[PDB]
């Protein structure tokens, strides 16, 4: 189907096919030497150059080598700099270049490549959609929003653009405005719209506005394989882990950690209160748009399994205590943090990102009435000096209607059924 051979390349098609046959047969080393010979003999051939890049790409996969892949990324760009490159080949080469740049985490480099593709092919709407993803990956929602507005101005029923536009609106707390874009985009069935993120945020947007249809989308997302259950909607999962909203210490196996937290809870409390009194700026407001109303801040000692040294200057005894427990300090998909919540606070129903952690709450200052936490269908309360444990990959919700502040200590642990091999290799969250 695609036209990849320019005038000269058609005259050397037999040599180009022989080299490509070696690549398809998995003889990568012979293939790179065949294409390097073609690039030597025909230095202007775009197909030979693209063959060299594809072989380096395959070699990077075989060796799991970032350095080899960086070579491929340069050769893909070289294809585009050659004379008389067929449009189909030019697009394929730069699209793979951007894709591999993103794989390596070169998000700035990928963005430049995507911008060049849109400049070269101004009528290709899918390339503009790819550029919007480039901005989303780097955290530039404003430019991403502009891109999808450009896409929807010419192709209003592009479902890929709709779900991404709706995602951005929702992330900007434009909850009502995001629902039709997310809903119409998923319903469009366009490639790229059957994605767990869009089911996740549509249902949540509906919940925030009181739309009872929300759980019909959770059930569908579960039916389509995006969620373990309609209750447990985390998207960064290891399949097969024991799934239940509430856990006892004995069930987790981390009874030594729990005993230490409960025996020593007052020192943890006292350091948290001292920061509240003398270093209040270390408590940072929650910034994930999870509050309907109220005040909620956190003072984080560990995140992604990394100790915050300056924070531990503010709670040195607590940090010294916790350092004995790698099941939490090494949990690279969790945090260790103080969490203060004040009256008038309602945290929206929401889900954490991963089923790979369990979340412990140690009560430090708990008002007698007005504070409670729901996980799945069960609501509980904290007690000073006592640990609660829940799987925050299940939907959970918090209320603070007391007449004074509520302070807890949050300690994430690896899910106990994750092997040591999984705990060292899982990407941090």
């Amino acid at each position: 189907k695609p036209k990849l051979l320019n005038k000269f390349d058609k005259t050397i098609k037999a040599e180009l096919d022989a080299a490509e046959k070696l690549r398809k047969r998995g003889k990568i080393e012979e293939a790179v030497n065949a294409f390097k010979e073609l690039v030597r003999k025909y230095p202007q051939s775009p197909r030979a150059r693209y063959g060299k890049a594809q072989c380096e790409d395959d070699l990077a996969e075989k060796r799991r080598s970032n350095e080899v892949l960086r070579g491929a990324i340069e050769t893909y760009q070289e294809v585009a700099s050659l004379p008389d490159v067929p449009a189909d080949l030019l697009k394929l080469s730069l699209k793979r270049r951007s894709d591999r740049q993103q794989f390596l985490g070169h998000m700035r480099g990928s963005l430049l490549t995507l911008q060049r593709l849109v400049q070269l092919f101004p009528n290709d709407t899918s390339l503009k959609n790819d550029l919007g993803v480039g901005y989303l990956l780097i955290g530039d929602n404003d430019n991403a929003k502009k891109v999808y507005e450009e896409v929807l101005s010419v192709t209003p029923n592009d479902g890929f653009a709709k779900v991404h536009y709706g995602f951005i609106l929702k992330a900007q707390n434009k909850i009502a405005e995001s629902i039709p874009y997310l809903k119409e985009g998923i319903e469009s069935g366009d490639p790229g719209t059957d994605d767990g993120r869009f089911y996740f945020h549509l249902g949540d947007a509906m919940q925030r506005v009181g739309n009872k249809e929300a759980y019909k989308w959770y059930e569908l997302g579960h039916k389509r394989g995006h969620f373990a259950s309609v209750w447990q909607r985390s998207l960064y999962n290891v399949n097969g882990l024991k799934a239940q909203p509430w856990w006892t210490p004995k069930e987790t196996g981390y009874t030594e950690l729990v005993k230490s937290l409960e025996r020593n809870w007052k020192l943890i409390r006292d350091e948290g209160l001292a920061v509240m009194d003398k270093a209040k700026g270390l408590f940072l407001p929650e910034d994930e748009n999870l509050r309907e109303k109220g005040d909620w801040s956190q003072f984080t000692l560990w995140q992604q399994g990394r100790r915050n040294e300056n924070a531990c200057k503010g709670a040195p005894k607590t940090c010294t205590l916790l350092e004995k427990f790698p099941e939490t300090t090494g949990c690279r998909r969790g945090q260790i943090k103080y969490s203060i919540m004040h009256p008038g606070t309602h945290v929206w129903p929401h889900t954490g990102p991963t089923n790979c952690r369990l979340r412990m709450h140690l009560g430090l200052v708990i008002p007698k009435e007005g504070c409670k936490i729901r996980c799945a269908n069960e609501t509980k309360t904290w007690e000073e000096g006592k640990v609660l444990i829940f799987d925050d990959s299940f939907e959970h919700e918090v209320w603070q209607d007391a007449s004074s502040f509520r302070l807890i200590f949050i300690v994430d642990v690896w899910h106990p059924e994750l092997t040591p091999q999984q705990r060292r290799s899982l990407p941090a969250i």
Partner: peptide, 18 residues
Amino acid sequence: GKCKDGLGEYTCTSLEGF
């Protein structure tokens, strides 16, 4: 930004190649 308590980011992990 990072997904700490929620799942609000487009991606919650950072790509580092192989």
